[PDB]
C-alpha cells in the first residue's frame, strides 16, 4: 500500500551542561530502524531493525556526522529561540523536528513533511507545496524571514523529492518481508464477573502491525459509542501492538454482544463473541 519514512529529532537544553541532549529516531511506517543519542559514550547512528544492518560503513559514518552537525545546529537554534522569546539562559527548553516523505503503492512521492515544535507547540512548518512555510509565531516569523532569504524551502524540497523517497523505496524493498507485511490481530474475548448479575467482556487484539486499529463493541448490531472502555494502543516490545476494548454487560445476555476488529491486515473485519 502507501508508506512513509520519518525522522524525529528532540533537542533539550541543559543549563550548566553546555550542549543540549540530541536524540534522533528514524521510522519506516511504524518500524523504528535507526537511532542516535548524543549522550552515548561514543555517539553514532545505530541499527534498530534487522533489514538496515546490511548497510555499509559509509552509511553509518556519514549519518553519524549528519547527526553530530545537526546537534550543534540545534544548539544554536535553541539560543536563537531563547533570544526570540526573551527567556533566560538558565532555563531548559525543547526543540523537536519531524520530517520525511510519503509514497503511494507505485513509489511516487505523495507528500513531504518538515516541521518544528518549540516547548511542545507548533513553531514553523513547510507547506504542502514544499516552497513556503507557515509560521505559528512572531518568533517563527523571524525564522521564516531568515529561511526565505536563504531559500531554505528549496533545500528541503531537494531532499524530500529526491533522496528521501529514494532511500524509502530501498528500505521497503530490503525489509519487504516485514514492511509490506500487515500482521492481522490475533483476537479473543475474556469474561470477568463483577457481581452476581454484572460481568465485563474484554475484546483483545494482540500481535498486530501496524498500530492503526479499531475495536468496536455491539449489542444486537448496535454500536456502543458510549459504554465502551478503550485503552490506547500500546507496543508489545516486539514491534507488534496491543489493544483492548471492554463493556460491562448483564449476566445472562452475553451472546447479544459482539466485538468487531478492523485492521489493515484484515480484508474482512473480524467478528468476535464469548466464548
Amino acid at each position: 500500500g502507501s508508506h512513509s519514512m520519518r525522522y524525529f529529532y528532540t533537542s533539550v537544553s541543559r543549563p550548566g551542561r553546555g550542549e543540549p541532549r540530541f536524540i534522533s529516531v528514524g521510522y519506516v511506517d511504524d518500524t523504528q530502524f535507526v537511532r542516535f543519542d548524543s549522550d552515548a559514550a561514543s555517539p553514532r547512528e545505530e541499527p534498530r531493525a534487522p533489514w538496515i544492518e546490511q548497510e555499509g560503513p559509509e552509511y553509518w559514518d556519514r549519518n553519524t556526522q549528519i547527526y553530530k552537525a545537526q546537534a550543534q545546529t540545534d544548539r544554536e537554534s535553541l539560543r536563537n529561540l531563547r533570544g526570540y522569546y526573551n527567556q533566560s539562559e538558565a532555563g531548559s527548553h525543547t526543540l523537536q523536528s519531524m520530517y520525511g516523505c510519503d509514497v503511494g503503492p507505485d513509489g511516487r512521492l505523495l507528500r513531504g513533511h518538515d516541521q518544528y515544535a518549540y516547548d511542545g507547540k507548533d513553531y514553523i512548518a513547510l507547506n504542502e507545496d514544499l516552497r513556503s512555510w507557515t509560521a505559528a509565531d512572531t518568533a517563527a516569523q523571524i525564522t521564516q524571514r531568515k529561511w526565505e532569504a536563504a531559500r531554505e524551502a528549496e533545500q528541503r524540497r531537494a531532499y524530500l523529492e529526491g533522496e528521501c523517497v529514494e532511500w524509502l523505496r530501498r528500505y521497503l524493498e530490503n525489509g519487504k518481508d516485514k514492511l509490506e507485511r500487515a500482521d492481522p490481530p490475533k483476537t479473543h474475548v475474556t469474561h470477568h464477573p463483577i457481581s452476581d448479575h454484572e460481568a465485563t467482556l474484554r475484546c483483545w487484539a494482540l500481535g498486530f502491525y501496524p498500530a492503526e486499529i479499531t475495536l468496536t463493541w455491539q449489542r444486537d448490531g448496535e454500536d456502543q459509542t458510549q459504554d465502551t472502555e478503550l485503552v490506547e494502543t500500546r507496543p508489545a516490545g516486539d514491534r507488534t501492538f496491543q489493544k483492548w476494548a471492554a463493556v460491562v454487560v448483564p449476566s445472562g445476555e452475553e451472546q447479544r454482544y459482539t466485538c468487531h476488529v478492523q485492521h489493515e491486515g484484515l480484508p474482512k473485519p473480524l467478528t468476535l463473541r464469548w466464548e
Binding site: 545546529t73 533545500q155 533522496e163
Partner: peptide, 11 residues
C-alpha cells in the same frame, strides 16, 4: 537516510 542538507540550518 536523514536529511544531511539541512544539518547546518539554524532557526
Amino acid at each position: 537516510h536523514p536529511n544531511g542538507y539541512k544539518s547546518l540550518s539554524t532557526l
